[PDB]
Design an enzyme around this catalytic site. Structure first.
Site, short mmCIF file in Angstrom:
data_model
loop_
_atom_site.label_atom_id
_atom_site.label_comp_id
_atom_site.label_asym_id
_atom_site.label_seq_id
_atom_site.Cartn_x
_atom_site.Cartn_y
_atom_site.Cartn_z
N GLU A 1 183.78 -18.89 -42.91
CA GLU A 1 183.35 -20.76 -42.32
C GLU A 1 184.96 -20.60 -43.49
O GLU A 1 184.51 -20.72 -44.92
CB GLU A 1 182.56 -21.30 -43.14
N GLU B 1 178.20 -34.31 -42.75
CA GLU B 1 177.38 -32.90 -43.45
C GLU B 1 176.47 -34.39 -44.87
O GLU B 1 176.85 -35.01 -45.26
CB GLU B 1 177.16 -31.72 -44.14
PD LIG Z 1 180.03 -25.68 -45.39
#
Ligand SMILES: [Pd+2]
Ligand SMILES: [Pd+2]
Ligand SMILES: [Pd+2]
Length: 223
Positions: free
Chosen positions: A116, A204
């Site tokens: 990621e 996020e």
């Molecule tokens: Pd992340």
């Protein structure tokens, strides 16, 4: 739309705006995602949110993504992208980042894989990347802190590389491939055996709010 449901998507190929509350059960609050302008040329959208409890845990990841054909990282010629965003109320715990996923087998779900790559354009509150900083590198003309860590969940050991800017970058443009190129020559990234599968950008949210995240415009292409 008021697509304030759990998982929602609005797309105008190859773009999409996605509401993603995959942590809605760790805290308490609400979050809707509104589309401002969405076409095959780019995405503009915003999301309002308020979350409490379960600090240290991401409650959602609202984002815009671009669909494309899985291809070996080493076969990528360039990933041009531009974005202009703004965070209304910085007294929160959240980040603004590009999220890229690669897997050693295209026949794997797009939720993870092996690697990621998070490119943090902003960090609010006390949150920080996974793992530890292992370097500071200059990519695309800017200085970034390189962080590395690996989480394993349900047996899925995932390696995460995070590039973090010292201060918020509300207006960014660049060739994301430069980050892959950096990782291949300086961190042993196995480019010739990893397929780029997902490219997203959003925020996020951990705790805080009411707060508003706005993406005036967003473009991304994988060549
Ligand atoms: Pd992340
Ligand atoms: Pd909404
Ligand atoms: Pd709104």
């Amino acid at each position: 739309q008021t697509m304030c449901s759990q998982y929602d998507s609005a797309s105008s190929p190859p773009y999409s705006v996605n509401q993603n509350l995959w942590g809605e059960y760790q805290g308490t609050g609400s979050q809707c995602v509104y589309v401002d302008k969405l076409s095959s040329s780019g995405a503009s959208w915003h999301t309002e949110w308020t979350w409490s409890g379960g600090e240290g845990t991401v409650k959602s990841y609202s984002n815009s993504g671009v669909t494309f054909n899985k291809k070996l990282v080493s076969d990528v010629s360039s990933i041009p992208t531009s974005v202009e965003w703004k965070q209304d109320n910085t007294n929160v715990n959240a980040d603004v980042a590009y999220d890229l996923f690669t897997a050693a087998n295209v026949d794997h779900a797009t939720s993870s894989g092996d690697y990621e790559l998070m490119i943090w354009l902003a960090r609010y509150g006390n949150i920080q990347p996974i793992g530890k900083q292992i370097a500071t590198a200059t990519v695309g003309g800017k200085s970034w802190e390189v962080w590395y860590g690996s989480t394993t969940q349900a047996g899925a050991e995932q390696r995460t590389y995070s590039f973090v800017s010292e201060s918020p970058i509300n207006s960014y443009s660049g060739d994301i491939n430069a980050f892959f190129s950096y990782l291949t020559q300086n961190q042993g990234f196995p480019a010739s055996s990893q397929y780029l599968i997902n490219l997203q950008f959003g925020t996020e949210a951990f705790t805080g709010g009411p707060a508003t995240f706005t993406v005036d415009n967003w473009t991304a292409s994988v060549n």
